[PDB]
Amino acid sequence: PQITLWKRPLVTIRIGGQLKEALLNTGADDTVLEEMNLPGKWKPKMIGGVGGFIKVRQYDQIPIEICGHKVIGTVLVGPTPVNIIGRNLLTQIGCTLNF
Amino acid sequence: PQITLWKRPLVTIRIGGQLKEALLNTGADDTVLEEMNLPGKWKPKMIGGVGGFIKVRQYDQIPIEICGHKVIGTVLVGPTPVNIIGRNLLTQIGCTLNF
Amino acid sequence: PGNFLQSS
DSSP: OEEOSSSOOEEEEEETTEEEEEEEOTTBSSOEESSOOOSSOOEEEEEEETTEEEEEEEEEEEEEEETTEEEEEEEEESOOSSOEEOHHHHTTTTOEEEO | OEEOSSSOOEEEEEETTEEEEEEEOTTBSSOEEOSOOOOSOOEEEEEEETTEEEEEEEEEEEEEEETTEEEEEEEEESOOSSOEEOHHHHTTTTOEEEO | OOBOOBBO
């Protein structure tokens, strides 16, 4: 697809049995999802953005389906205002910015 | 150009004789630059991100050059950790997310 | 919000 930017680039993602809306975010290094209870170990982590830092849980090698692409990588979980797909997963679906 | 997302999509912009490094950010509604002086009237605004809100000054109809494209729009100035080019200007340069 | 810059 070619996604224009007149509206927020929101997509549906599937993570296990859950369907969520998420923002395709070239301004994020990492993918951050709203609080949820993922399987497996996790390391606490701090991430920074426009208003300061938040604390999140880092889970590795988590499968997610995004626009019919299956990706497997690191997912951060915490008090993000919106579910964010960052460059770590954008690269796995082959996303580029074009103009 | 086509810009891949292996690294942060940083570009140099020009704003009235000043060069600045800025992040092409599909997760930002607006364009926000670190503290600087700009001419004309402005009004305060609160904008939110990961980690909460910050107070910025809103300046309207500012001309900026971004990757050879001469655009005009609203520029917010305040304590963003990095300069951000948001959707308000990405739409003017014809930017899409492709995969 | 806004402006979803994010970094580690």
